[PDB]
Amino acid sequence: YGKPGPDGPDGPKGKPGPKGKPGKPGKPGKP
């Protein structure tokens, strides 16, 4: 039999990360 086969091709790029958390609400205005 021949030589061991070549190393496999790299895998595909990962999926995008999840969308970030919402920013905090602003505090009520001064009276």
Binding site: Y1, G2, K3, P4, G5, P6, D7, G8, P9, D10, G11, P12, K13, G14, K15, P16, G17, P18, K19, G20, K21, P22, G23, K24, P25, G26, K27, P28, G29, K30, P31
Partner: protein
């Protein structure tokens, strides 16, 4: 002598990306 082995299987997909950044905190309310 004879055929070489098959290529290895394709690699695994890469890890999921990092979480997106938080949105900006909202401005405080207008004065009363």
């Amino acid at each position: 002598y004879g055929p070489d082995g098959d290529p290895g299987d394709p690699g695994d997909p890469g890890p999921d990306g990092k979480p997106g950044p938080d949105g900006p905190d909202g401005p405080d309310g207008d004065p009363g």
